[PDB]
Amino acid sequence: LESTESRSSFSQHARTSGRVAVEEVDEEGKFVRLRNKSNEDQSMGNWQIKRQNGDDPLLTYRFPPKFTLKAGQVVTIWAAGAGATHSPPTDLVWKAQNTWGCGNSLRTALINSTGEEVAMRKLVRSVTVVE
């Protein structure tokens, strides 16, 4: 039997301002979950989620023109390929994009209605195998 050895690192860099954080990002490109961590509702009409997968072209999801993330609640935005059911206010389906994107560097940023980044979560996976 041949010997095996590997080093795998998974890092998550999160930054949050305001009421809504990027709570969880799927490594399989299926969903992005946001959470209102405050005790007040947050209107997110025409807010955006910008996804930067390494040097890939930027993917931009846009919320419905009227959408509220209530206090303490979560919303999961599913890519169209995930096979999820569109069920607001907790589950929204991004019909135009089949995947959020897979890769070793995944940056997900929440953008408010005026174009400012208010929260983000960046996933980085590094793997080295001994040859």
Side-chain angles (χ1 to χ4, degrees), residues 96-110:
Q97 201 46 46
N98 219 277
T99 177
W100 277 100
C102 302
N104 295 86
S105 176
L106 317 169
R107 186 181 197 281
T108 307
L110 186 61

Side-chain angles (χ1 to χ4, degrees), residues 20-22 32-35 42-50 60-69 74-78 86 88-94 100 108-113 118:
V20 184
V22 185
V32 164
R33 186 177 80 210
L34 313 177
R35 150 112 50 197
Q42 176 68 59
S43 49
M44 284 165 82
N46 281 327
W47 285 33
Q48 303 164 279
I49 300 171
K50 292 194 191 175
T60 305
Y61 167 80
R62 199 182 271 281
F63 278 89
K66 295 302 226 253
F67 184 82
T68 298
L69 186 52
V74 293
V75 53
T76 301
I77 299 94
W78 298 89
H86 187 80
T90 63
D91 294 90
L92 309 181
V93 173
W94 189 9
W100 277 100
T108 307
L110 186 61
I111 319 289
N112 63 17
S113 55
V118 296

Side-chain angles (χ1 to χ4, degrees), residues 19-20 36 38-44 67-73:
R19 307 186 176 95
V20 184
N36 184 335
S38 82
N39 53 18
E40 319 170 86
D41 298 347
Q42 176 68 59
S43 49
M44 284 165 82
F67 184 82
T68 298
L69 186 52
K70 281 216 144 197
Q73 304 319 289

Side-chain angles (χ1 to χ4, degrees), residues 106-131:
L106 317 169
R107 186 181 197 281
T108 307
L110 186 61
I111 319 289
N112 63 17
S113 55
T114 46
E116 337 185 272
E117 178 182 308
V118 296
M120 67 85 93
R121 176 167 294 262
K122 184 175 183 347
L123 270 46
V124 170
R125 181 165 292 275
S126 289
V127 180
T128 54
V129 176
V130 174
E131 319 247 10

